[PDB]
Amino acid sequence: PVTKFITINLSKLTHKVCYKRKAPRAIKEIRSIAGKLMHTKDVRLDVKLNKFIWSKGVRNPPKRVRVKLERKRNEKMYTIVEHVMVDSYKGLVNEC
Amino acid sequence: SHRKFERPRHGSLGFLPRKRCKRLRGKIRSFPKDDKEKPPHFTAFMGYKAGMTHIVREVDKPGSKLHKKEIVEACTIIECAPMVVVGIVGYRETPKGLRILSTVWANHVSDEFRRRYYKNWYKSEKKAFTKSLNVPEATKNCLLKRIEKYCTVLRAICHTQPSKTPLRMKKAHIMEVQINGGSMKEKLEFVKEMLEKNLPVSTVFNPNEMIDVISVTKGHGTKGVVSRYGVKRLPRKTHRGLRKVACIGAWHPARVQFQIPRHGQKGYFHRTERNKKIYRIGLKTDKNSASTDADITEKKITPMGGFPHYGVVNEDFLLLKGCVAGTKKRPITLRKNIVPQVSRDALAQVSLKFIDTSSKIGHGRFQTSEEKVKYYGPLK
Amino acid sequence: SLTLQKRLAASVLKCGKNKIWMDPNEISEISLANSRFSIRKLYKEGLILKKPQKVHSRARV
RNA sequence: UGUAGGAGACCGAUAGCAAACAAGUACCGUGAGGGAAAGAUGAAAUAGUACUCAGGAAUGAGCAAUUAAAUAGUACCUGAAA
RNA sequence: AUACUGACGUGCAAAUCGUUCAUUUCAAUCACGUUUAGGGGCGAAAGACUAAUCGAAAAGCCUAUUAGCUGGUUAUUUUCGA
RNA sequence: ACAUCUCCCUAGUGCAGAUCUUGGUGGAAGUAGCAACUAUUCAAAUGAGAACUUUGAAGACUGAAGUGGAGAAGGGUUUCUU
RNA sequence: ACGACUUUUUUGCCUCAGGGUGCUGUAAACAUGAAAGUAAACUUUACGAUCUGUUGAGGCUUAUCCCUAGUGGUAAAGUGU
């Protein structure tokens, strides 16, 4: 089991869809990426992240989120996405 | 009774049914005819569309209103990595058409060629080609001799090297190229001599040449009749919509006549363009490939910031007058003209004067990054 | 589940349903409540709180 | 006609009183009024489905079990056609 | 309820929806109570309206009204036959 | 429970059709379609099972001509707890 | 439209980031700066649309833009013959 820190550009992913579904899609897209990446069918999306994504309201979700992924076990395996506040996105890359 | 006023029908009949093409790659329907006297030579060449630019050209043409001045013209860029020849094919004429007699292959074929005869190269055990390739040279000679004795047309099997391009795919494009020229023996000699080596565009064409271009059109999916055929819209008041034809035929005969256009597929059609003049044949090694006698600046053909959806040309390239069917990233097939061209155009010598290499992403202000940096000065 | 208790809480406080805060934990202790008297006890304890008004200012005016 | 008897070369549950059944009922109509559908296990349920197993539950299965008979299981006679 | 002869037109409705529009201190609007009943009532009059029913309401009866007209009008073989 | 052709009495007696009547049933068909009323998300609980049960956190709308309070006609136990 | 087609599956590809290219038009922040004037001290202190400086800045730029053997990734292993 492993711990990762990523930055997901929500703007590219969310690009297509209408205002009405925009913020929902950003939440949905987080669930999708985290499961696909970490190899679980189960992703728990922390309320803090949910609050941050919805903070500027339905028309425009934040452009970039720094998310922290946590492999947990006790089917059995799952992961929780947790949000990391940041001063600036610039110059941050993937890390383990 | 007769319709109240008369117009040409919308859209040509001559391309119906307007269904999707079988294949992404183009196909030559017919080759130039084999004039015996000329030496053996290639008739076609495969290339990738990179984008369009504009060019500035000085005009000789006398008695024209335009006359002496330089003019600005649209032009297409087709990247041409050198083709690799891999096989020789001999056809023979029968009342029931051309039938292939035999095919003779080279002693190696590269992975990029090999990938095309699979769907799943990664998953495969890559066992294709290896045991036929082995068989000894007497066998090859015997088949060649059989071909030599009877065949009436000889064609060469050529392929693209997609790794010498920026394109995503690695399954090469294979295409047959007919050889027109001398005796069957000479034709065979020329292909044998060529065989496993690589063939660049300069061997197949000449500056100022007139060329035929074969390419599959831009897709749009299924489009409405107005868009697909050009039909004039119905008035606004109309109850069940307006963007659709108002009759699809008379009462008799009691079927929908085919000629009336209906909604459906648009694009991804096969098309043969004729008679496009080649303005310049680039050289990969040259730094000055896009330079001119008027400009005298060191620069490559690839425009500022790269071609939209194609980026950086790196091999040899053709700068072709005007436009040619199909999208960015598409294969284009170049074909020699069916009859040698005798027009006042076909004789003409194009001394091109300037080639833009400014951006095609937004409205370009500079011809190079070096120019841009110089223009502004110190920045953060 | 907590419907009844929420309706009673509105009456006990003198305040709109929309403003009642029921602790999201210790829900069982709330669930046992079944009378206005029980709500008064819960309110005394800290397990039901009145939310503030959604704040609004004449300052700008 | 009301009520009581007795009858039949009468009808046999889409018939015959509208009505063999909790029928002038249900139901519909502001109202005057209009106004139905729907009978049958078996000899005996004082034989009406015990018990085990799989099921959250319905149910199912059984080496288990009432019956002469349960492909007679409460939609219970027979069980045509589409 | 004017226009869109717009939406819907196997409707969201046996007259609905959107936009546009006419109307607002008076020949104004609404509620409830009350009055007038079928060749009758009522009508700032369209043969309008009188409970989705109006150039004669709704209900039942006279009544299984009546129809030189339409449709239907049921096993076989055999004989003569318009 | 059923025949009767031995003879013969008797009749509500023989159906494909009547836009027949009544009851059942298909192809059309897993289709038309489930479109008004700005729009939801995350976590927790309950449970066999939760997009639309409950709770918290957000984000939203109604916006005192209100899906807020009261009341009238009509409805009639629709109320409440379990 | 769905199919279908085009691809790729570790000298790849996705992923961010840096660079390129543009697009917008000069961020926040601070100044005992400027600014129509204004008011109140026994020259100094208050308010102040706006403007200037640090500032061709800041922000955004592939989701169907370009480059990068730069970062971290790259599961399932089913099914038919």
Short mmCIF file of C-alpha atoms in Angstrom, two decimals, chain B residues 118-119 191:
data_model
loop_
_atom_site.label_atom_id
_atom_site.label_comp_id
_atom_site.label_asym_id
_atom_site.label_seq_id
_atom_site.Cartn_x
_atom_site.Cartn_y
_atom_site.Cartn_z
CA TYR B 118 -0.93 -7.57 -37.18
CA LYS B 119 -3.60 -5.82 -35.18
CA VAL B 191 13.26 -2.46 -59.05
#
